[PDB]
C-alpha cells in the first residue's frame, strides 16, 4: 500500500495549488483521509480531513476558508485545493489514510502516510 502525494510546487503569494493523493494497494473509499503539513524547523501539524461519509470534512483554523479538501473515489484520490496562499503556508504536505475504515472523528495515529509534496509560497 502506498499514498503519493503530487502538485507541489511554488507559487507567487495569492495564487493557488491543487495536491493530489493517489494511492495504491487498496481502495480507501471507506476510510477517512486527511492532509498535514511540516513546515521547516516544526512540528507536524494537522491541515484537513474528508470523511468517508459524504459531504463530512474537518479543517485547521489557520487555513480555513482558504484550503478545501474533496475526494474522488473512482481515481482512488483526495485533493487539497489551496486558495489564497500566503508565505506561511511554506511546508512539505503530507496525506494520510485513517488506521481503521468506517472511523468516527475521534484522534487515531494515522495508519498510513505519503513521502510528502513541497509547496514554497513566495513573498
Ligand atoms: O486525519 C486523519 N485523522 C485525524 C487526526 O487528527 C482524526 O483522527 C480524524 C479521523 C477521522 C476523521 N473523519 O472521519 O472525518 C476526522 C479526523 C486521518 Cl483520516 Cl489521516
Given at each position: 500500500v502506498q499514498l503519493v502525494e503530487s502538485g507541489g510546487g511554488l507559487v507567487q503569494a495569492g495564487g493557488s495549488l491543487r495536491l493530489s493523493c493517489a494511492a495504491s494497494?487498496?481502495?480507501?473509499?471507506?476510510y477517512a483521509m486527511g492532509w498535514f503539513r511540516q513546515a521547516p524547523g516544526k512540528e507536524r501539524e494537522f491541515v484537513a480531513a474528508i470523511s468517508?461519509?459524504?459531504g463530512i470534512t474537518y479543517?485547521?483554523?489557520?487555513?480555513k476558508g482558504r484550503f478545501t479538501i474533496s475526494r474522488d473515489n473512482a481515481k482512488?484520490?483526495?485533493?487539497?485545493?489551496?486558495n489564497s496562499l500566503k508565505?506561511?503556508?511554506?511546508?512539505?504536505?503530507?496525506?494520510?489514510?485513517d488506521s481503521?475504515?468506517?472511523?468516527?472523528?475521534?484522534?487515531?495515529?494515522?495508519?498510513?502516510?505519503?513521502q510528502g509534496t513541497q509547496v514554497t509560497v513566495s513573498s
Open positions: 494497494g487498496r481502495s480507501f473509499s471507506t468517508w461519509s459524504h479543517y485547521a483554523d489557520s487555513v482512488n484520490t483526495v485533493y487539497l485545493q489551496m508565505p506561511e503556508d511554506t511546508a512539505v504536505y503530507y496525506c494520510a489514510a481503521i475504515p468506517y472511523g468516527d472523528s475521534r484522534y487515531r495515529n494515522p495508519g498510513y502516510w505519503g
